[PDB]
């Protein structure tokens, strides 16, 4: 089987220097140009995805629609989830990250950033920066919508759906793209790599650049992962 | 149920004077920014889709995802159908359409593009303007797909699809949006609003201006269909 | 792509002499046999169904649940649809076969029962025997659900089912297993074979046996048909 | 919103005093009447399921489907997952329960069978009754299906399901039957009403008796839950 991934490039936040997390923050001019790239990375190095998963988030959903039209695979089958979902950031959701290096000191905002398991402080479920009761999640059960995450957390409810959803797919020969965010790929390659909790705070994915897997039929890499510009990966 | 019908500003090839159907041509530069008024438009009049379903053509494609980023509602599900795919044009497909109407004279060419039920000549399923074997119809029966189409044509193969799958979305609440065609959605109101044969020639449905059917538990219109600029759609 | 075709044996109003049609009537037992015996030819024959399609009506539906139940292959996907149903009888739905015989004569009844294209007088919405509003239905563009209907009528509803999605099963090479009744099958197997407006009428599928389809690329048959038992169904 | 659960009837497994976990074990005879009781209560109570859900697994799945049949809804859409199927026994699938009493003492036996998180030791690969490598499962990712588990492991891979697509039917306001079983069941009943991890082995779900949930908006019991018979559930 296999799999890309394409994580987006800036949204209008990244700029402005504040926390985006689930925060349906729109793609920047900088950032629509990067999907642009990546589609024509897709057509370019023919890799043809037949299917694609996308988040609730905007900026991802957008990035994919701009790089299947420069890849001319714009009629194929799409799925979103919440489960690709970017980390929440929960309290940190909508603040100035300087302000916040000065306010936790670096320790505490390394932690929040990229500790594995300890999360941001929990939102306010009234704040205004709170995805509380937005539409694009009324169907789900109330009860599992985080306040915030952890990359261990995100790893957790994105499982789910990698294991039933995007498996299904996968395991019945079709090639999936995957449109989603830095956190949510970094759980997914932390998972198909069985790289250690300690080892994946390291880990950075470039916005905009594909990053292809050939899978084994128990969906495990069978040969390193590989972007499709490698010298701008690195 | 509320239904909201949007048709693809023009193509590069409309720009060029060729005849489409089902090539996969791309969107003008132009069309891009009708589909961005479109968007302005449903967020403006406040009409939110809740689905939304396009053809297997990427400029209904295109301008469904351009649309929606401006109404911002990229987030909602998304199916396609090829039922939904423009008139399919013969083998008219790609040819010039000046170069067209001086080989047949202007009664046969009015009839090509404006007759009810009268089909160009089918295309060859070896040309380069053929979509026979095309990979985004690989799973509907060879046997249906056209090589050919009229309105009437596309109306009959349409239908079912909104019968089954589109009615389904309707009855359960949701607002529909489709991003189509000129014939597809000519069709499409030709059925909802009983026009006859001969009457819907007439009929033309502006580009990038959505248009809104409040429908009844029938799925009958419950007041007329509007434009959500109906100055623009009226010039 | 592989395809399985089963009859569902005797409602119970087969018996009592009344045209069923869209009344929902229950399997007999003798039904419930013939169901548990086509399960287990499916199993004894080594045809392994992959997903399943049934129509609406409880008979079709109960015949696969048996089926499977004998066949080991319970935990299957299913999918249901109306336009898999039997032929809608119109007013003749749950009317007496001697009577209807009498008020009619030899001719028209034969007509109604056996023509092509001449449905029975349609049902009034009114009568106890009329599906209309019934909730199995209610997602479905009303305006599409027959009063009545001939031969022709159900393999018109029929044909795009199975064009967008018995089709794209089949042609992902999965085995499917149709669970339906005589004139929704006779109807698909007419298309499937080629056979005559004027053949058809002689095309009787066995109740309780498997008829299963080799098919080729292009959904048509790759060799002839074959029942499971060749004996019990040509007897 | 309202949810119906049932709990299978015995297995000709549960019969014979044989540990069953995944095994795919047919139902009993005494199974397929508590089956056909199931069916004629949600009838006589009013409670009219408009989807079902069930696991991979026979024995639940011909439950749903006599009930159904008793209902007089055989019509609704059926959708099966493997995150619903009971909990998977490891080493002491297809071993008698009485000569595990004795092999592992009244503490180390009681502990597999009713302890929170401690599960049973996994079944080799290559055992007569692992479910490795099966049929219908084999579009999951084959790393996340289980050669044992606990209750806690039950509900951690029950729950996504459940979050996702039992609670996008629920909350469209349908009425969602469940057809699971022991451990599974319990395990949504653990969530459902907030019952701590020291308390779940307490809990009791009489086999062939629907368990009607009226739940508020954040799908928590608006309500205590309740048997179709108070009575027998309760005896």
Redesign the interface.
């Known amino acids: 089987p296999k799999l890309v991934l394409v994580r987006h490039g800036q949204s209008e936040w990244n700029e402005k220097n504040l926390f985006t997390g689930w925060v349906?923050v729109?793609l920047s001019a900088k950032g629509q140009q990067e999907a642009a790239r990546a589609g024509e990375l897709l057509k370019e190095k023919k890799v043809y995805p037949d299917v694609l998963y996308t988040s609730?988030?905007?900026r991802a959903?957008?990035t994919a629609?701009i790089a299947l039209?420069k890849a001319?695979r714009?009629?194929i089958?799409?799925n979103?989830?919440w489960?690709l979902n970017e980390r929440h950031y929960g309290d940190l959701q909508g603040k100035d990250k300087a302000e916040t290096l000065k306010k936790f000191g670096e320790e505490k905002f390394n932690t929040y950033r990229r500790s594995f398991d300890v999360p941001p402080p929990p939102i306010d479920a009234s704040s205004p920066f709170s995805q509380k009761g937005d539409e694009?999640y009324?169907?789900?059960?109330?009860?599992?919508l985080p306040e915030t995450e952890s990359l261990a957390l995100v790893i957790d409810?994105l499982?789910?759906?990698?294991?039933?959803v995007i498996?299904?797919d996968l395991?019945?020969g079709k090639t999936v793209m995957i449109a989603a965010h830095g956190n949510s790929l970094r759980g997914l390659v932390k998972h198909l790599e069985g790289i250690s909790d300690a080892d994946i705070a390291k880990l950075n994915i470039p916005t905009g650049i594909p990053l292809v897997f050939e899978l084994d039929?128990?969906?495990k890499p069978s040969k390193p992962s590989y972007y499709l510009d490698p010298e701008a990966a690195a």
């Open positions: 349906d729109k609730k988030l905007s959903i957008q629609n039209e001319d714009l009629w089958p799409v979103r989830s489960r694009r009324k169907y789900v059960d109330p009860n599992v409810r499982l789910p759906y990698w294991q039933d498996a299904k395991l019945s039929e128990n969906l």
